[PDB]
Amino acid sequence: YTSTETSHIDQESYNFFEKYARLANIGYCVGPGTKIFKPFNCGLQCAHFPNVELIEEFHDPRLIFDVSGYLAVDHASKQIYLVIRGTHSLEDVITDIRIMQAPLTNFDLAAQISSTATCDDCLVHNGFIQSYQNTYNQIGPKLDSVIEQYPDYQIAVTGHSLGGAAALLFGINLKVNGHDPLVVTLGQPIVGNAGFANWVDKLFFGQENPDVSKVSKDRKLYRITHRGDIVPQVPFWDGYQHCSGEVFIDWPLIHPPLSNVVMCQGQSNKQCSAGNTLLQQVNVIGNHLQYFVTEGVCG
Numbered sequence: 001y002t003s004t005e006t007s008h009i010d011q012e013s014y015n016f017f018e019k020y021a022r023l024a025n026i027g028y029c030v031g032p033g034t035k036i037f038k039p040f041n042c043g044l045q046c047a048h049f050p051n052v053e054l055i056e057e058f059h060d061p062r063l064i065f066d067v068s069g070y071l072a073v074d075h076a077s078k079q080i081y082l083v084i085r086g087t088h089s090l091e092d093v094i095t096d097i098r099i100m101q102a103p104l105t106n107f108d109l110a111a112q113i114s115s116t117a118t119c120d121d122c123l124v125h126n127g128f129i130q131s132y133q134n135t136y137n138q139i140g141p142k143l144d145s146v147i148e149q150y151p152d153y154q155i156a157v158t159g160h161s162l163g164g165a166a167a168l169l170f171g172i173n174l175k176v177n178g179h180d181p182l183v184v185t186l187g188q189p190i191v192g193n194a195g196f197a198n199w200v201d202k203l204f205f206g207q208e209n210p211d212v213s214k215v216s217k218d219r220k221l222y223r224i225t226h227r228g229d230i231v232p233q234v235p236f237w238d239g240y241q242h243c244s245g246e247v248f249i250d251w252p253l254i255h256p257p258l259s260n261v262v263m264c265q266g267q268s269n270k271q272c273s274a275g276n277t278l279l280q281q282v283n284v285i286g287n288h289l290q291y292f293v294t295e296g297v298c299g
Helices: 011-029 090-098 126-149 162-176 194-205 284-289
Strands: 002-007 052-059 067-074 079-086 104-106 123-125 154-160 182-186 221-226 246-249 261-266
Touching: 011 067, 011 079, 011 154, 011 162, 011 182, 011 221, 011 261, 052 126, 067 126, 067 162, 079 126, 079 162, 090 284, 104 126, 123 126, 123 194, 126 162, 154 162, 162 182, 162 194, 162 221, 194 221
Parallel strands: 079 154, 154 182, 182 221, 221 246
Antiparallel strands: 002 261, 052 067, 067 079, 104 123, 246 261
């Protein structure tokens, strides 16, 4: 639940987190005035992904919690990528969440999730539920058909900021529906309550208070947090609780040293995201962008 134990990582584990940071950052070409061109052209950021075919990019701007992103296939790594991101600017989204009522509602309210799947006390931020709903409404069917077209391809869901919260929720939806997804989130805010947090921990790790110390070959959930980023501590409300397991960038900038990317134990950790202080909490946006690569920008 709350520990202070941290663990160092491999260069392979580092490259794995940076890969998903890059893929999550690519989601920012999907907005207006920019686009990802087929097969996968978005400036030389997409160049790190030479074996990727873009299926469909999507965007909905009518609600603050509305989502944009892309669906793509990786022919080399044999994977289906679902990258989610909040349509609206990081500032308008961060401030709304940061300085507002964060009302919780039961998760089985959302599409493709029923009472048998979730616990009764599995409560989630109502806004993030709309973020998840918007994702499905825009890409659920297309993804289901792509899953049929590539049945041996592993599904990987990623997102930064609000997109991270939507990636976690979409990730649980696939996990619960007989699929086996990889969920990598970057700077994701707190999604639900203790009931949701402990349910996700059982879903992805098999038990409560799990051992989330090692990058396993079989591990499917990763929550990437950074020094000074206030977003993974938002909402500040007591009802909100993170699931395990945190991956912490204990470095002020992008491209951190291998030694400064740590594996955090527990749902809250004083040595990691939970220990963020006032002075490390000055560059609200600045700190939210630094996840291996500077997030929120695409060629």
